Symmetry: D2
């Protein structure tokens, strides 16, 4: 109970303070030496262990379906990702994808669809995936071209998805395809596609700078039953956006966890590195660099948990979640870059904490709405609200 800790803020309830201590204790006991050599196996083990400890319940909505509660506790999910990321980006990834990959089912699935998938997801017995981006269309989601033609009681799916997290190890994929009811964003549908669907191919595994399971998927005329559709034909675009919206602040929270770890490493190095008859921390320039790192972190944390608290009041957080993800991810890049600088040569030595952080942060500014997209979201929302106030 540190009065200066962020957990003392009135954005949090007692259950969040208890949860934060619980996931930190679990992370210390389980993430001391995570093997990045075989990430497929490591992710499978992480999902199982997270499931067994109860941590995957918070990303699922509906207690009867294995959820922690009938709504998703945004503050809890943020605290889980922030803590896991502080310890190991792969553990954060494994928990995050159980939420994002199943979220469309929480939001739009029928009773039987929820019963079939969400208990196993919440227990860590099924690995989930979210398949939206394509080679020619990532930011421009509304122009996706994965085809889903109706034929009988099923849909025949043709084309590719890429950058699919958990690609190759997921037990099912929530897949968004163009069914063609109307142009652009109005002709998309969403499907639950089991990994063993005939016609579903793992076309290639993708290597990124922070390695984790990632694949390009090819659909070779795959037939999935119409009963596997989430929502109504043409409702897929709003389902995708609503799913991303649930977890947007928790992406910001993961960035914050990486940033906090970078400051931990920068502080330890400043305080211990002897140089020029003193320590690195005795120089003004080091002190103000650390101060800016802490300022950025506190700003990020306040924005993250303002947005999560506000969503947990039942409000839409279009502007506040965009601010948090933008600020936390860009801020984490700045904090980590400063920490690398503080560590000197060791800062770029393979395997060190700050060097791994330098790789884990970079992609978070790109996916789930690149920084530029977040800025536009906030700007347009400001002008939208100004216009509404004027029309009153």
């Amino acid at each position: 109970i540190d009065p200066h800790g962020a957990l003392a803020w009135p954005f949090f309830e007692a259950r969040h303070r208890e949860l934060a201590a619980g996931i930190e204790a679990w992370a210390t006991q389980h993430l001391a030496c995570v093997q990045h050599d075989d990430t497929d196996t490591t992710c499978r083990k992480l999902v199982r262990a997270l499931g067994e400890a109860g941590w995957l319940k918070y990303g699922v909505g509906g207690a009867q379906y294995g959820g922690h509660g009938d709504t998703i506790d945004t503050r809890a999910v943020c605290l889980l990702r922030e803590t896991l990321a502080n310890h190991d980006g792969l553990a954060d990834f494994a928990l995050a994808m159980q939420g994002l990959g199943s979220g469309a089912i929480t939001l739009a699935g029928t009773h039987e669809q929820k019963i079939r998938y969400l208990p196993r997801v919440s227990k860590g017995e099924a690995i989930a995936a979210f398949a939206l981006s394509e080679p020619d269309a990532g930011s421009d989601v509304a122009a996706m071209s994965l085809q889903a033609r109706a034929e009988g009681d099923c849909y025949v799916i043709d084309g590719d998805k890429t950058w699919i997290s958990n690609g190759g190890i997921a037990d099912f994929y929530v897949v968004f395809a163009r069914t063609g009811e109307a142009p652009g964003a109005r002709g998309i549908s969403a499907f639950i596609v089991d990994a063993d669907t005939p016609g579903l191919q793992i076309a290639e595994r993708i290597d990124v700078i922070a390695p984790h399971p990632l694949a390009r998927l090819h659909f070779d005329s795959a037939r999935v039953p119409r009963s596997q559709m989430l929502g109504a034909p043409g409702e897929g675009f709003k389902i995708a956006m609503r799913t991303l919206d649930v977890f947007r602040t928790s992406v910001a929270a993961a960035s914050l966890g990486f940033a906090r770890r970078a400051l931990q490493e920068g502080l330890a190095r400043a305080a211990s590195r002897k140089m020029f008859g003193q320590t690195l921390g005795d120089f003004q320039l080091t002190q103000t660099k650390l101060a800016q790192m802490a300022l950025t972190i506190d700003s990020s944390a306040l924005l993250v948990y303002r947005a999560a608290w506000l969503r947990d009041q039942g409000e839409n957080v279009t502007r506040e979640a965009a601010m948090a993800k933008w600020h936390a991810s860009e801020g984490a890049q700045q904090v980590i870059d400063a920490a690398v600088q503080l560590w000197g040569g060791m800062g770029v030595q393979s395997g060190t904490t700050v060097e791994r952080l330098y790789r884990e942060i970079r992609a978070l500014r790109i996916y789930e709405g690149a920084t530029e997209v977040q800025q536009l979201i906030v700007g347009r929302d400001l002008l939208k609200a100004h216009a509404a106030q004027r029309q009153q």
Copy 2:
């Protein structure tokens, strides 16, 4: 109550939401056309009007001395300055100086000293001033050279103070002078010096870029009874620092108020300025510029009221208040600068709102602990806490 408004945050209590509406109503009624030509007269009028409306009680400690309560409600003082600064810098100045100028009496006065000065300050019937800085020493307070030499039951005060807000119109000054008990910061004493003390002269008024009452004071062997000392001989330096600490977040809150006004002006101009067949707000560069203004404002506001909330819980806020004053004042400069840019030539036209803001914000980064000093305070506190953690 706007669920997206900052007042909904649980940093605030019900009384703060009522106060925020009340001071906004007062400002709307009373600040419609503030006269910047004769600031002596305007400030005297503002102090009286704020006092009569009860708004000066919040910067005074002790109900029996005219204060709102026995302790300073820092969240309330911040809301007062944020609102007043959002309307007019002179109104914020007038309220702020009644707090800063009397705070050493709230903190260190005897009962008789508090009775003689604080009720009039709280009623707006006596204008307060805080005289610490000198021509040769502003940042380096511990080396101040105003002399106070004991003589019988009085002190003979000799030398200058300068940059003194309300100088020339104040009814009293809290003055810090070297009495010499020990070197440096341990040789300073604090005095209440009535403006009619023989030998206290106004050497000159001072013209600054955002004009307001300001003077160089010449103590020309001015004799002050020993009974006008605040505290014990040699305790003056701590009284000065503790007085500044009380109001540090409120300086951040004034910066935030100026920044909010700038975003209001920038938004109105973006939405209404037709150009290139559309409006200025239709351009991406405008939208991302506005988004960054709002992000800096929300970060600043969260830091201000986190710090104020935490201090109101009875905790020291050395790190949090420095973060707030630093981030809000530097942030407001950037927001205001962006609003000037959006307004084009009108942004530098004398008397327009954003042109005034460009002048009003600049000194806030300099006084009450320049930005560079705030950065060092945060950085040294980070290393102090880190060393305390390592010892454990």
Copy 3:
């Protein structure tokens, strides 16, 4: 000759080194205590004194018309503005407007037009002005609404221009007006409008944060002879843009001069301000702030004089001049802001050098193509060149 000075760079020739020494000596003698109380009178005196000393010849093209050479020496004009701004923004302003206000005549005048106006401009005997912007159209020049209507052998001008530098003291205005040959940027024409033209009204003097002569002009059916048109009907937009192109790097040079003055003041204060048992300059943070000021200054100066040198080789400088004006004006704001900070309370005291610089720099990021417009010019040019390559 300081080997570390920018004048030693091979962007410059001997005549530029000699010019820089001459204008610096003139400024040191004539700008020791410029009066900002009555800027109309001060500008009139500055124009005459600059003209008498020969410094206004560099902004005029053609020796028979009073100019130094047959073309405008961009490096020379930049060095003049940089030096004058270093000393006093009003002196920089006075010289700058003699160039900008007369440039369209240098560029597009007939022999008779150049004879009538350029000798007087070069001698400081006619104060020039450039009237382009309007209340509803500044950045969006192509949409201007000042109207020029052909009637017999004259044009009748109705409407407003605003933000007009030297408004109220200029002897003539180069005015751009819609003649309507085609929509938008293709229906504009340029006119020389003498200040004594009946119907031309000084509607309002404008006060800005760094004051200087500035007015809104109202044209109440002002009749100007067709022979006062600069160039052909419909050529006005190109003439306005080409005139701004000529002097664009010299706005960057003025910004650089302001920045250099800010560093001089910041260095002087750092070295002499005693605090905490040492000087302000002994702190790491002061040393790195000073370092960043100097780095921004050298990068701006290299960009300014690269662009000016390139234009003086007879080449277009669309990208390079935009880089210079963008970088130098935004950079000068940062350098000046850092100098204000080093001076503490004195940094915001009216009348100190750094306080004046904080006011003098701000408009330069707005006029003659705001920073955002310069950024788009550069980015579009990069993509244009890439599409060819």
Copy 4:
């Protein structure tokens, strides 16, 4: 009037908007830039990053055979291009090589840094023995200065050199040593004890086969290349192998880093230019929202800032290199160039990664490699903060000199 160029322009030998047209350059620099670009396009089409020991050995030999290692060596009779190092030439070589492949830049750069102390402080006999092979690419050079406990603080190094008879006995460790494990000799800086601190250092030429020299471990960094920790177990080297006088090793170390200060900045610029090329290509071809990525204002102004940073860095680099080539000290100008180019290249590369989206962080893309190749150039040969202090202190030193005069 006068134009800088005329007849060569008429011969279509000069691009007037190119940086090579700047009067900071002579005709020989334009020729060299064209030659090294031709060599790079021919020889660097598919650099293998799997076995960097073998690739670097191949690169050094090929660069030497083509004459490009002569520019980093001083003294024509010893294989150098001229009697002094042509700074502008060495910058152009690194800028071009870095633009193509960081390992080719590395291989050339280390031939210069590794032999630079021999050029500056070597006796006639020392230069004859080492510099011809270096300049031919027949000997791989290395520069052994940093220690686990002392990198920025060179004056605090603890490697020991003990005089014994007419030899010196060396004990202790060096680390972060580029070309460690493949070098034929190391210039080693060790404390000999003539005086405390920066005055008790001496420089030695230490052949790789010197008994007692051990390659303790190979170091893996985010942009992999030959790197090792060296351990000296009572290594005996003759007093004749000392570079300069006893106690002069600190000045020799610092002057060698000075000779090549602008050249690291020039490599940073080559990486940044490549990032802009990739950014423009992606912006012009990536279709989205019914137009291209380059049609958005944000993309245009981001590209504009990338080019602005590049042009500012290039002007700073070649201003400094030109000035040093006139025989002047460039304490302030070279520190500006290294600080700005390295921080600037990081920003340019980061922007190019962002323009490429997911592919920006996909292993093997050009921009992903650049994001890794750039990071260490901000840390070594004077971390950014050290350069800032050099500039700020020089400003104050010059200001004080004027106040006296």
